[PDB]
């Protein structure tokens with residue numbers, strides 16, 4: 001038996017790792033299970049374009065074309081596919097999209113919006129990647145059972161937000177391993193529950209709590225520096241100094257990623273006693289998560305000999 | 306400083322750890338021990354080495370205290 | 371000849387945040403404790419049931435200092451209530467023993483924290 005906790009702040013990738021434990025270790029989502037996510041894909045798409053439009057007021061951004069004003073009114077009341085397309089391709093809308101760190105926008109927004117033709121067909125069935133990309137908040141615990149290398153994994157997914165903290169204390173008993181997820185792409189983002197709080201500082205202070213807690217003295221601490229794909233893209237246009245004003249390295253994936261790893265690993269106040277097992281991950285990439293989780297399992301076996 | 310080490314209520318052989326042990330207070334003793342402090346080891350009662358004999362002969366009161 | 375003095379039975383040293391929390395408890399400041407309990411719920415910074423080396427707890431120190439509002443706030447934020455009634459009885463104070471007797475049943479949800 002292995003008790004495994006998926007921890008981390010809101011939107012860090014926890015439940016996406018949980019989706020991967022289905023497909024990687026099992027037959028995975030059925031066409032019928034995929035079909036159940038259609039309304040979520042639609043909602044995520046609609047809510048994302050609404051969020052961008054709404055932000056254009058806060059940001060003092062006009063539509064590229066006046067005709068989009070009526071499309072925006074139509075969008076709020078709601079042909080829908082046409083309206084979303086025209087808005088998304090507008091230059092004002094795109095200027096706002098480019099500045100999404102100044103508001104709250106789902107990571108999968110452009111994924112879906114760029115695939116609007118496909119997802120809007122009457123016969124649309126979400127693909128497995130479409131499912132992995134969905135955003136559904138996780139409130140309460142999500143204990144699921146899986147068996148890897150013949151280990152009986154008892155896996156606990158929990159809410160990452162600060163409102164969901166109350167559930168965390170009940171699950172702390174007998175934890176073999178924690179996978180602590182950190183969205184690499186959050187250095188320049190603010191919390192949805194606190195827009196004067198940077199997301200990466202929030203993830204540090206929790207990791208300071210979770211790594212140094214006396215409950216997890218013998219627990220294997222695994223750090224997933226997640227959303228590596230989004231980070232690779234973002235780092236070329238948003239400087240790391242937003243998060244770490246002292247950083248004098250390059251705004252390149254390898255250097256900036258390495259620096260973040262160092263900042264998190266430095267939070268370990270028992271370095272001559274305890275390892276952190278760090279992996280760079282893309283939680284939506286099945287091949288990557290399978291490889292990383294295999295490695296993680298080996299660490300857990302080796303640490304329970 | 307000249308002429309102000311005239312009066313001390315404590316004898317010069319008193320180190321802080323010895324006085325903390327004399328007062329028998331747990332917190333002060335713990336704080337002093339945490340800072341790498343030592344106490345000299347007394348010799349055997351039936352000692353006839355050169356330093357014990359010389360110290361007893363020169364100043365017996367200081368040695369006994 | 372330099373008898374070595376060292377702590378041969380060393381307890382686990384308190385964290386700095388824990389030291390600040392119990393120093394605030396023994397100080398008697400009501401305002402400082404509440405932000406610590408909210409941040410210990412949210413950020414999990416301070417274990418409320420921590421133990422200074424001289425055999426005392428935050429609820430138990432509040433028992434010795436006989437302050438009842440810090441008692442009420444701590445036990446509202448779910449301190450381990452067991453074995454504290456004996457210290458209140460030995461303190462021979464009516465208010466503390468009445469408060470711990472009255473709030474043994476605060477409509478307890480999800481049993482006790484581990």
Ligand SMILES: Nc1nc2c(ncn2[C@@H]2O[C@H](COP(=O)(O)OP(=O)(O)OP(=O)(O)O)[C@@H](O)[C@H]2O)c(=O)[nH]1
Pocket residue numbers: 008009010011012013014015016017107108132133134135136137138139158159160161181226227228229230281282283284285
């Ligand atoms: N492309 C990509 N998308 C990711 C990655 N990690 C997370 N996402 C997406 O971003 C969102 C975050 O994933 P979630 O599973 O909701 O994150 P979480 O930490 O479980 O969120 P909570 O429910 O708040 O705990 C989802 O829409 C995911 O599909 C990643 O590495 N790559």
Ligand SMILES: [Zn+2]
Pocket residue numbers: 348349352353354355356357358
């Ligand atoms: Zn001698």
